[PDB]
Design a protein around this ligand. Structure first.
Ligand SMILES: [Mn+2]
Ligand SMILES: [Mn+2]
Lengths: 201, 201
């Protein structure tokens, strides 16, 4: 019974970092499709009324005939829902508050985090995501996942994510993913990232 | 070392099925990069003077440090080299010769083959390829692979392939991968596919 969340901003609010056409297609076409696909698979089951984050966390405990649809399409839903919120037309800059202090203590500083985040995003071959996550031991880790796999079913709570599927950047950047990653930094909503960190802890 | 093969046709020869801009970017940027990367990984090794298909076939026997680069970038080189040859500005229609008879005997007919090929191409979640391949027992199979994985290192010989990485279709088709798959049928060079079948025997 999931529905498409409204973006916190207009489709063209992230220019010149992300083009308006991509934001609209990514939202109304790609994200909608994940939501429709997981809704059809969950219909008539006892798992149809769970929050998306809880469902994806319990992936391995689901029946065999549901794991495929939930991993890919439920994964797509949770990941893109998070993605839209950690971007902002007034984003960029450096983190502050406790996420800054956690980045300093856990990852060795903002400059080291970006080095690791960029490497993870560049090194993901094929479709996937780069993540900053909170572990069960309440520490930050940088990681990447394939396709729509989410750190949620690995026990981690992602607080920042970058979509590196080619549909997220090909219209404006074509093959130049490093350039796209550089633009992502200019749009990161660190106030939202701080919010998610407080909740994960 | 490997070098970028010239296309058998102009960059706009496949219109209206594949756009000229994509053909140029796909060839001169994406394929070139695979070639550059696998050449760098092979430099100074005992594998630097092998045909790419032989190299990719022997993937599982390569040293650990070479398996990643050859799988992804050598796979990328082999897959795209095949791809360019099985497209044609005068393609489409139905297969003929020995591959046609094999499609009837092994796959149940051209209509059944397209049904299976389309399903494999549509259902490949993330980046990948849809394939018509010849098995070690010399029969036809429809299959799909992830990223640049090639049926070659699983013992199969691909004779026809469709790239369903989003970079292969997003500029013209955006999210409409089914539309792209339908157009691909119009551009297939079945004369080349027959040659590849005969060579696989
Ligand atoms: Mn996406
Ligand atoms: Mn390609």
């Amino acid at each position: 019974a999931y529905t498409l969340p409204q973006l916190p901003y207009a489709y063209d609010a992230l220019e010149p970092n992300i083009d308006a056409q991509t934001m609209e297609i990514h939202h109304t076409k790609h994200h909608q499709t994940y939501i429709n696909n997981v809704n059809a698979a969950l219909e008539g089951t006892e798992y149809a009324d769970l929050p998306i984050e809880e469902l994806v966390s319990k992936l391995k405990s689901l029946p065999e005939n549901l794991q495929g649809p939930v991993r890919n399409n439920g994964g797509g839903h949770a990941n893109h829902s998070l993605f839209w919120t950690v971007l902002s037309p007034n984003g960029g800059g450096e983190p502050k508050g406790e996420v800054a202090k956690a980045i300093d203590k856990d990852l060795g500083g903002f400059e080291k985090f970006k080095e690791a985040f960029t490497k993870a995003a560049v090194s993901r071959f094929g479709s996937g995501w780069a993540w900053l996550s909170v572990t069960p031991d309440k520490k930050l880790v940088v990681e990447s996942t394939a396709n729509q796999d989410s750190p949620l079913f690995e026990g981690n709570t992602p607080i920042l994510g970058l979509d590196v599927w080619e549909h997220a950047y090909y219209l404006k950047y074509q093959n130049r993913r490093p350039e796209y990653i550089g633009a992502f930094y200019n749009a990161v909503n660190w106030e939202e990232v701080e919010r998610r960190y407080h909740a994960a802890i």
